[PDB]
Amino acid sequence: EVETFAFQAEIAQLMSLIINTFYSNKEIFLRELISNSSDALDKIRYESLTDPSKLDSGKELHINLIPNKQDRTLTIVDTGIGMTKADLINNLGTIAKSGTKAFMEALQAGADISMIGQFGVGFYSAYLVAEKVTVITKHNDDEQYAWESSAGGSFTVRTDTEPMGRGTKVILHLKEDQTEYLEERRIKEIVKKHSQFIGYPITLFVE
Amino acid sequence: EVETFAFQAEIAQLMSLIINTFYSNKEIFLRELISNSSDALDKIRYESLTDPSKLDSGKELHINLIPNKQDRTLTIVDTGIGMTKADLINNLGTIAKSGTKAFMEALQAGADISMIGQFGVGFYSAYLVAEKVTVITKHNDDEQYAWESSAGGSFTVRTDTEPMGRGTKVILHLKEDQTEYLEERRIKEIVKKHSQFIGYPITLFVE
Ligand SMILES: Cc1nc(N)nc2c1CSCC2
Numbered sequence: 001e002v003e004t005f006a007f008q009a010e011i012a013q014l015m016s017l018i019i020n021t022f023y024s025n026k027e028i029f030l031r032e033l034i035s036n037s038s039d040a041l042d043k044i045r046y047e048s049l050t051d052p053s054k055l056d057s058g059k060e061l062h063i064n065l066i067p068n069k070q071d072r073t074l075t076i077v078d079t080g081i082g083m084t085k086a087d088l089i090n091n092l093g094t095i096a097k098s099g100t101k102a103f104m105e106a107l108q109a110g111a112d113i114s115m116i117g118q119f120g121v122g123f124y125s126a127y128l129v130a131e132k133v134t135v136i137t138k139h140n141d142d143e144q145y146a147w148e149s150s151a152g153g154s155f156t157v158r159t160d161t162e163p164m165g166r167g168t169k170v171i172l173h174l175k176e177d178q179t180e181y182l183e184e185r186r187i188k189e190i191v192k193k194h195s196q197f198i199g200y201p202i203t204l205f206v207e
Numbered sequence: 208e209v210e211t212f213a214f215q216a217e218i219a220q221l222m223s224l225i226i227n228t229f230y231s232n233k234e235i236f237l238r239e240l241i242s243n244s245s246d247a248l249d250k251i252r253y254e255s256l257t258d259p260s261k262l263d264s265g266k267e268l269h270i271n272l273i274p275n276k277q278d279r280t281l282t283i284v285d286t287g288i289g290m291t292k293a294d295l296i297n298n299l300g301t302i303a304k305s306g307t308k309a310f311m312e313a314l315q316a317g318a319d320i321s322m323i324g325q326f327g328v329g330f331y332s333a334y335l336v337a338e339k340v341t342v343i344t345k346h347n348d349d350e351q352y353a354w355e356s357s358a359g360g361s362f363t364v365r366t367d368t369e370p371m372g373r374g375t376k377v378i379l380h381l382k383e384d385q386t387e388y389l390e391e392r393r394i395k396e397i398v399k400k401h402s403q404f405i406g407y408p409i410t411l412f413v414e
Protein backbone atom coordinates (compact mmCIF):
# COMPACT_ATOMS: atom_id res chain seq x y z
CA GLU A 1 0.00 0.00 0.00
CA VAL A 2 1.41 3.37 -1.13
CA GLU A 3 -0.50 6.38 0.19
CA THR A 4 -0.18 9.66 -1.75
CA PHE A 5 -0.60 13.02 -0.01
CA ALA A 6 -0.80 16.62 -1.21
CA PHE A 7 1.79 19.00 0.26
CA GLN A 8 0.13 21.87 2.07
CA ALA A 9 0.02 24.87 -0.30
CA GLU A 10 2.75 26.84 1.52
CA ILE A 11 5.14 23.87 1.56
CA ALA A 12 4.55 23.29 -2.16
CA GLN A 13 5.30 26.99 -2.78
CA LEU A 14 8.44 26.74 -0.62
CA MET A 15 9.64 23.74 -2.63
CA SER A 16 8.82 25.41 -5.92
CA LEU A 17 10.83 28.45 -4.71
CA ILE A 18 13.83 26.30 -3.74
CA ILE A 19 13.68 24.52 -7.11
CA ASN A 20 13.28 27.47 -9.46
CA THR A 21 15.14 30.38 -7.84
CA PHE A 22 18.63 31.01 -9.30
CA TYR A 23 21.01 30.45 -6.41
CA SER A 24 24.53 29.15 -6.98
CA ASN A 25 25.48 28.32 -3.39
CA LYS A 26 23.73 24.95 -3.40
CA GLU A 27 26.24 23.29 -0.99
CA ILE A 28 24.37 24.50 2.07
CA PHE A 29 21.90 21.59 1.67
CA LEU A 30 24.41 19.32 3.37
CA ARG A 31 24.94 21.59 6.33
CA GLU A 32 21.15 21.76 6.81
CA LEU A 33 20.68 17.98 6.69
CA ILE A 34 23.58 17.27 9.03
CA SER A 35 22.20 19.88 11.40
CA ASN A 36 18.80 18.11 11.25
CA SER A 37 20.51 14.80 12.06
CA SER A 38 22.39 16.51 14.88
CA ASP A 39 19.08 17.84 16.39
CA ALA A 40 17.55 14.31 16.11
CA LEU A 41 20.56 12.79 17.88
CA ASP A 42 20.34 15.41 20.65
CA LYS A 43 16.66 14.45 21.00
CA ILE A 44 17.19 10.72 21.51
CA ARG A 45 20.14 11.45 23.76
CA TYR A 46 18.04 13.74 25.97
CA GLU A 47 15.29 11.12 26.20
CA SER A 48 17.80 8.40 27.09
CA LEU A 49 19.07 10.46 30.03
CA THR A 50 15.93 9.52 31.97
CA ASP A 51 15.03 6.29 30.17
CA PRO A 52 18.09 4.37 28.95
CA SER A 53 15.80 1.75 27.38
CA LYS A 54 15.16 4.29 24.65
CA LEU A 55 18.61 3.20 23.35
CA ASP A 56 17.69 -0.47 23.19
CA SER A 57 17.17 0.20 19.46
CA GLY A 58 20.83 1.23 19.22
CA LYS A 59 23.38 2.82 21.50
CA GLU A 60 25.67 4.47 18.92
CA LEU A 61 24.86 8.10 18.05
CA HIS A 62 26.37 9.03 14.69
CA ILE A 63 25.94 10.43 11.18
CA ASN A 64 27.11 8.64 8.03
CA LEU A 65 27.49 10.27 4.59
CA ILE A 66 27.21 7.72 1.85
CA PRO A 67 27.86 8.61 -1.79
CA ASN A 68 27.01 6.13 -4.52
CA LYS A 69 28.08 7.12 -8.02
CA GLN A 70 26.28 4.26 -9.77
CA ASP A 71 22.92 5.15 -8.16
CA ARG A 72 23.73 8.87 -8.29
CA THR A 73 22.65 9.17 -4.65
CA LEU A 74 24.05 10.86 -1.61
CA THR A 75 22.60 9.48 1.63
CA ILE A 76 22.71 11.12 5.02
CA VAL A 77 22.13 8.56 7.79
CA ASP A 78 21.71 9.26 11.50
CA THR A 79 20.81 7.17 14.51
CA GLY A 80 18.72 10.02 16.00
CA ILE A 81 15.15 9.99 17.26
CA GLY A 82 13.67 9.10 13.87
CA MET A 83 10.10 9.96 12.89
CA THR A 84 6.71 8.30 13.37
CA LYS A 85 4.34 7.94 10.41
CA ALA A 86 2.39 10.90 11.80
CA ASP A 87 5.62 12.97 11.93
CA LEU A 88 6.43 12.19 8.33
CA ILE A 89 3.02 13.21 7.07
CA ASN A 90 3.09 16.34 9.23
CA ASN A 91 5.93 17.84 7.18
CA LEU A 92 8.66 15.50 8.53
CA GLY A 93 8.21 16.83 12.12
CA THR A 94 8.81 20.46 11.14
CA ILE A 95 6.62 23.54 11.70
CA ALA A 96 6.82 23.94 7.96
CA LYS A 97 3.74 26.14 7.42
CA SER A 98 4.70 28.89 9.87
CA GLY A 99 8.39 28.27 9.13
CA THR A 100 7.83 28.96 5.43
CA LYS A 101 6.03 32.24 6.24
CA ALA A 102 8.77 33.53 8.51
CA PHE A 103 11.33 32.45 5.85
CA MET A 104 9.35 34.31 3.17
CA GLU A 105 9.04 37.46 5.25
CA ALA A 106 12.76 37.03 5.94
CA LEU A 107 13.53 36.78 2.23
CA GLN A 108 11.61 40.05 1.92
CA ALA A 109 13.70 41.94 4.49
CA GLY A 110 16.88 40.78 2.75
CA ALA A 111 17.47 37.20 3.85
CA ASP A 112 19.38 34.70 1.76
CA ILE A 113 18.27 31.14 0.88
CA SER A 114 21.23 29.97 3.00
CA MET A 115 19.31 31.16 6.08
CA ILE A 116 16.46 28.67 5.40
CA GLY A 117 17.56 26.66 8.43
CA GLN A 118 16.82 29.43 10.92
CA PHE A 119 13.10 28.88 10.11
CA GLY A 120 12.83 25.16 10.76
CA VAL A 121 12.57 24.13 7.09
CA GLY A 122 16.19 23.40 6.14
CA PHE A 123 15.13 19.89 5.11
CA TYR A 124 13.57 21.23 1.92
CA SER A 125 16.99 22.59 0.86
CA ALA A 126 17.61 19.00 -0.23
CA TYR A 127 15.74 20.12 -3.36
CA LEU A 128 18.62 22.47 -4.32
CA VAL A 129 20.47 19.32 -5.52
CA ALA A 130 18.02 16.41 -5.59
CA GLU A 131 15.44 15.63 -8.24
CA LYS A 132 13.95 13.14 -5.76
CA VAL A 133 14.30 12.63 -2.01
CA THR A 134 13.51 9.39 -0.25
CA VAL A 135 13.39 9.42 3.59
CA ILE A 136 13.56 6.10 5.44
CA THR A 137 12.91 6.48 9.15
CA LYS A 138 12.28 4.41 12.32
CA HIS A 139 11.10 5.95 15.58
CA ASN A 140 11.02 3.80 18.76
CA ASP A 141 7.20 4.16 18.93
CA ASP A 142 6.37 3.07 15.36
CA GLU A 143 7.22 0.87 12.33
CA GLN A 144 9.78 1.75 9.62
CA TYR A 145 8.39 4.04 6.89
CA ALA A 146 9.53 5.40 3.57
CA TRP A 147 8.52 8.92 2.54
CA GLU A 148 9.25 10.03 -0.98
CA SER A 149 8.79 13.10 -3.20
CA SER A 150 10.00 14.50 -6.48
CA ALA A 151 8.17 17.66 -5.53
CA GLY A 152 5.45 18.72 -8.00
CA GLY A 153 2.97 19.01 -5.11
CA SER A 154 2.75 15.46 -3.70
CA PHE A 155 4.59 12.94 -1.54
CA THR A 156 4.02 9.25 -0.78
CA VAL A 157 4.33 7.25 2.40
CA ARG A 158 4.64 3.44 2.59
CA THR A 159 5.83 0.93 5.16
CA ASP A 160 9.42 0.03 4.46
CA THR A 161 10.45 -3.65 4.48
CA GLU A 162 16.26 -3.22 5.36
CA PRO A 163 15.64 -2.65 9.09
CA MET A 164 17.65 0.19 10.53
CA GLY A 165 16.93 -0.01 14.26
CA ARG A 166 16.34 3.68 14.95
CA GLY A 167 16.98 6.86 12.99
CA THR A 168 16.57 8.47 9.61
CA LYS A 169 18.15 8.04 6.21
CA VAL A 170 17.78 10.89 3.72
CA ILE A 171 18.49 9.58 0.24
CA LEU A 172 19.24 12.36 -2.27
CA HIS A 173 18.72 11.28 -5.90
CA LEU A 174 20.90 14.05 -7.34
CA LYS A 175 20.07 16.16 -10.38
CA GLU A 176 22.29 15.15 -13.28
CA ASP A 177 24.30 18.36 -13.10
CA GLN A 178 24.97 18.11 -9.35
CA THR A 179 27.13 14.98 -9.20
CA GLU A 180 29.98 16.99 -7.71
CA TYR A 181 28.29 16.17 -4.36
CA LEU A 182 29.27 12.53 -4.82
CA GLU A 183 32.97 13.49 -4.85
CA GLU A 184 34.92 12.63 -1.73
CA ARG A 185 36.99 15.80 -1.77
CA ARG A 186 33.98 18.01 -2.44
CA ILE A 187 32.04 16.44 0.46
CA LYS A 188 35.06 16.80 2.77
CA GLU A 189 35.43 20.50 1.86
CA ILE A 190 31.78 21.17 2.63
CA VAL A 191 31.71 19.26 5.90
CA LYS A 192 34.83 21.10 7.00
CA LYS A 193 33.49 24.49 5.88
CA HIS A 194 29.99 24.25 7.44
CA SER A 195 29.84 21.32 9.88
CA GLN A 196 33.25 21.43 11.62
CA PHE A 197 31.91 21.45 15.16
CA ILE A 198 28.98 19.01 15.03
CA GLY A 199 28.93 16.96 18.25
CA TYR A 200 28.63 13.48 16.76
CA PRO A 201 31.10 11.66 14.60
CA ILE A 202 30.52 12.12 10.89
CA THR A 203 31.83 9.25 8.77
CA LEU A 204 32.26 9.87 5.05
CA PHE A 205 31.99 6.48 3.36
CA VAL A 206 34.32 5.54 0.47
CA GLU A 207 33.35 3.94 -2.81
CA GLU B 208 10.24 23.64 50.49
CA VAL B 209 13.41 24.69 48.63
CA GLU B 210 15.43 21.78 47.24
CA THR B 211 19.14 22.38 46.54
CA PHE B 212 20.98 20.40 43.88
CA ALA B 213 24.63 20.11 42.82
CA PHE B 214 25.37 20.94 39.18
CA GLN B 215 26.96 18.00 37.40
CA ALA B 216 30.75 18.55 37.38
CA GLU B 217 30.94 19.38 33.65
CA ILE B 218 28.13 21.95 33.88
CA ALA B 219 29.80 23.58 36.89
CA GLN B 220 33.06 23.74 34.89
CA LEU B 221 31.18 25.21 31.90
CA MET B 222 29.67 27.89 34.12
CA SER B 223 32.98 28.63 35.78
CA LEU B 224 34.49 28.98 32.27
CA ILE B 225 31.75 31.38 31.14
CA ILE B 226 32.18 33.43 34.32
CA ASN B 227 35.96 33.74 34.46
CA THR B 228 37.16 33.77 30.84
CA PHE B 229 37.96 37.27 29.50
CA TYR B 230 35.53 37.79 26.63
CA SER B 231 34.26 41.25 25.73
CA ASN B 232 31.44 40.29 23.36
CA LYS B 233 28.96 39.58 26.15
CA GLU B 234 25.88 40.70 24.10
CA ILE B 235 25.46 37.27 22.54
CA PHE B 236 23.67 36.08 25.73
CA LEU B 237 20.49 37.70 24.46
CA ARG B 238 20.62 36.07 21.08
CA GLU B 239 21.07 32.68 22.78
CA LEU B 240 18.11 33.17 25.14
CA ILE B 241 15.80 34.44 22.42
CA SER B 242 16.83 31.49 20.28
CA ASN B 243 15.97 29.16 23.21
CA SER B 244 12.56 30.83 23.51
CA SER B 245 12.10 30.50 19.75
CA ASP B 246 12.86 26.70 19.92
CA ALA B 247 10.36 26.35 22.84
CA LEU B 248 7.67 28.18 20.85
CA ASP B 249 8.31 25.96 17.81
CA LYS B 250 7.88 22.97 20.14
CA ILE B 251 4.48 23.92 21.51
CA ARG B 252 3.38 24.98 18.06
CA TYR B 253 4.34 21.59 16.59
CA GLU B 254 2.48 19.77 19.37
CA SER B 255 -0.62 21.93 18.86
CA LEU B 256 -0.76 20.96 15.18
CA THR B 257 -2.12 17.56 16.19
CA ASP B 258 -3.63 18.46 19.57
CA PRO B 259 -4.99 22.03 19.67
CA SER B 260 -5.92 21.55 23.34
CA LYS B 261 -2.22 21.95 24.08
CA LEU B 262 -2.92 25.70 23.58
CA ASP B 263 -5.69 25.81 26.16
CA SER B 264 -2.99 27.24 28.46
CA GLY B 265 -2.56 30.14 26.03
CA LYS B 266 -2.91 30.67 22.31
CA GLU B 267 -0.48 33.57 21.80
CA LEU B 268 3.10 32.61 20.86
CA HIS B 269 5.49 35.44 21.67
CA ILE B 270 8.65 36.67 23.40
CA ASN B 271 8.76 39.69 25.71
CA LEU B 272 11.95 41.49 26.82
CA ILE B 273 11.42 43.27 30.08
CA PRO B 274 14.07 45.56 31.57
CA ASN B 275 13.69 46.85 35.11
CA LYS B 276 16.28 49.39 36.21
CA GLN B 277 15.18 49.46 39.85
CA ASP B 278 15.53 45.66 40.21
CA ARG B 279 18.52 45.60 37.86
CA THR B 280 16.91 42.71 35.98
CA LEU B 281 16.39 41.87 32.36
CA THR B 282 13.68 39.25 31.84
CA ILE B 283 13.12 37.17 28.74
CA VAL B 284 9.58 35.76 28.67
CA ASP B 285 8.16 33.28 26.16
CA THR B 286 4.91 31.38 25.86
CA GLY B 287 6.73 28.27 24.55
CA ILE B 288 6.54 24.68 25.75
CA GLY B 289 7.92 25.48 29.21
CA MET B 290 9.71 22.90 31.35
CA THR B 291 8.59 20.22 33.81
CA LYS B 292 10.30 19.94 37.21
CA ALA B 293 12.25 16.97 35.82
CA ASP B 294 13.38 19.10 32.84
CA LEU B 295 14.61 21.86 35.10
CA ILE B 296 16.66 19.53 37.25
CA ASN B 297 18.02 17.77 34.16
CA ASN B 298 19.96 20.87 33.09
CA LEU B 299 16.87 22.88 31.96
CA GLY B 300 16.04 20.31 29.22
CA THR B 301 19.46 20.55 27.56
CA ILE B 302 22.00 17.81 26.77
CA ALA B 303 24.37 19.88 28.84
CA LYS B 304 26.94 17.19 29.71
CA SER B 305 27.68 16.08 26.15
CA GLY B 306 27.03 19.63 24.91
CA THR B 307 29.73 21.00 27.21
CA LYS B 308 32.24 18.40 25.93
CA ALA B 309 31.62 19.15 22.27
CA PHE B 310 31.82 22.90 23.12
CA MET B 311 35.13 22.32 24.94
CA GLU B 312 36.60 20.28 22.10
CA ALA B 313 35.30 23.05 19.83
CA LEU B 314 37.05 25.71 21.89
CA GLN B 315 40.18 23.61 21.41
CA ALA B 316 39.99 23.55 17.60
CA GLY B 317 39.52 27.33 17.57
CA ALA B 318 35.89 27.98 18.45
CA ASP B 319 34.72 31.19 20.06
CA ILE B 320 32.46 31.51 23.14
CA SER B 321 29.89 33.04 20.77
CA MET B 322 29.44 29.58 19.24
CA ILE B 323 28.21 28.14 22.58
CA GLY B 324 24.72 27.84 21.12
CA GLN B 325 25.72 25.32 18.46
CA PHE B 326 26.28 22.82 21.34
CA GLY B 327 22.92 23.04 23.06
CA VAL B 328 24.15 25.01 26.10
CA GLY B 329 23.53 28.64 25.08
CA PHE B 330 21.39 29.06 28.21
CA TYR B 331 24.50 29.21 30.39
CA SER B 332 25.68 32.29 28.43
CA ALA B 333 23.25 34.14 30.71
CA TYR B 334 26.19 34.04 33.14
CA LEU B 335 28.20 36.41 30.90
CA VAL B 336 26.02 39.24 32.31
CA ALA B 337 24.04 37.89 35.27
CA GLU B 338 25.27 37.36 38.82
CA LYS B 339 22.08 35.35 39.40
CA VAL B 340 19.53 33.73 37.08
CA THR B 341 16.02 32.83 38.13
CA VAL B 342 13.93 30.67 35.74
CA ILE B 343 10.16 30.53 36.24
CA THR B 344 8.51 27.94 34.03
CA LYS B 345 5.16 26.16 33.47
CA HIS B 346 4.78 23.13 31.22
CA ASN B 347 1.27 21.81 30.40
CA ASP B 348 2.05 18.52 32.21
CA ASP B 349 3.26 19.99 35.54
CA GLU B 350 3.02 22.77 38.16
CA GLN B 351 4.86 26.12 38.00
CA TYR B 352 8.45 25.96 39.29
CA ALA B 353 11.24 28.38 40.04
CA TRP B 354 14.85 27.36 39.37
CA GLU B 355 17.59 29.60 40.62
CA SER B 356 21.40 29.76 40.65
CA SER B 357 24.19 32.21 41.32
CA ALA B 358 26.52 29.53 40.04
CA GLY B 359 29.17 28.40 42.56
CA GLY B 360 28.18 24.77 41.94
CA SER B 361 24.53 24.59 43.06
CA PHE B 362 20.99 25.48 42.01
CA THR B 363 17.63 25.38 43.81
CA VAL B 364 14.18 24.36 42.68
CA ARG B 365 10.92 25.32 44.42
CA THR B 366 7.26 25.45 43.48
CA ASP B 367 6.36 28.96 42.41
CA THR B 368 3.19 30.57 43.79
CA GLU B 369 2.17 34.75 39.78
CA PRO B 370 0.66 32.13 37.44
CA MET B 371 1.89 32.41 33.89
CA GLY B 372 -0.24 29.86 32.02
CA ARG B 373 2.49 28.23 29.93
CA GLY B 374 6.08 29.13 29.12
CA THR B 375 9.33 30.25 30.65
CA LYS B 376 10.63 33.46 32.17
CA VAL B 377 14.40 33.89 32.43
CA ILE B 378 15.15 36.60 34.95
CA LEU B 379 18.71 37.97 34.65
CA HIS B 380 19.92 39.72 37.83
CA LEU B 381 22.65 41.68 36.05
CA LYS B 382 26.19 42.18 37.33
CA GLU B 383 26.64 45.76 38.48
CA ASP B 384 28.87 46.63 35.53
CA GLN B 385 26.47 45.23 32.91
CA THR B 386 23.51 47.58 33.29
CA GLU B 387 23.89 48.68 29.68
CA TYR B 388 21.62 45.68 28.92
CA LEU B 389 18.75 47.50 30.61
CA GLU B 390 18.99 50.34 28.07
CA GLU B 391 16.26 50.45 25.46
CA ARG B 392 18.57 51.49 22.64
CA ARG B 393 21.20 48.92 23.56
CA ILE B 394 18.60 46.12 23.62
CA LYS B 395 17.16 47.28 20.28
CA GLU B 396 20.63 47.28 18.68
CA ILE B 397 21.30 43.73 19.86
CA VAL B 398 17.94 42.34 18.84
CA LYS B 399 18.36 43.91 15.41
CA LYS B 400 21.96 42.69 15.06
CA HIS B 401 21.42 39.05 16.13
CA SER B 402 17.69 38.25 16.24
CA GLN B 403 16.30 40.08 13.18
CA PHE B 404 14.56 37.09 11.65
CA ILE B 405 13.07 35.27 14.66
CA GLY B 406 9.62 33.95 13.73
CA TYR B 407 7.65 35.24 16.72
CA PRO B 408 6.98 38.80 17.69
CA ILE B 409 9.50 40.20 20.13
CA THR B 410 8.14 43.02 22.29
CA LEU B 411 10.64 45.23 24.09
CA PHE B 412 8.85 46.64 27.13
CA VAL B 413 9.33 50.28 28.18
CA GLU B 414 9.99 51.59 31.67
C1 LIG C 1 13.91 13.39 13.48
C2 LIG C 1 14.45 13.95 12.18
N1 LIG C 1 15.60 13.47 11.66
C3 LIG C 1 16.14 13.93 10.53
N2 LIG C 1 17.31 13.38 10.13
N3 LIG C 1 15.58 14.93 9.80
C4 LIG C 1 14.39 15.48 10.19
C5 LIG C 1 13.76 15.01 11.43
C6 LIG C 1 12.49 15.64 11.90
S1 LIG C 1 12.84 17.37 11.73
C7 LIG C 1 13.36 17.79 10.11
C8 LIG C 1 13.75 16.55 9.34
Ligand SMILES: Cc1nc(N)nc2c1CSCC2
Nearest residue numbers: 243244247289299300330375
Ligand atom coordinates in the same frame (compact mmCIF):
# COMPACT_ATOMS: atom_id res chain seq x y z
C1 LIG D 1 11.61 24.97 27.03
C2 LIG D 1 12.71 25.99 27.25
N1 LIG D 1 12.43 27.30 27.20
C3 LIG D 1 13.36 28.26 27.37
N2 LIG D 1 12.95 29.54 27.28
N3 LIG D 1 14.66 27.98 27.62
C4 LIG D 1 15.07 26.68 27.73
C5 LIG D 1 14.10 25.60 27.55
C6 LIG D 1 14.54 24.17 27.62
S1 LIG D 1 16.00 24.18 26.61
C7 LIG D 1 17.16 25.39 27.12
C8 LIG D 1 16.52 26.38 28.06
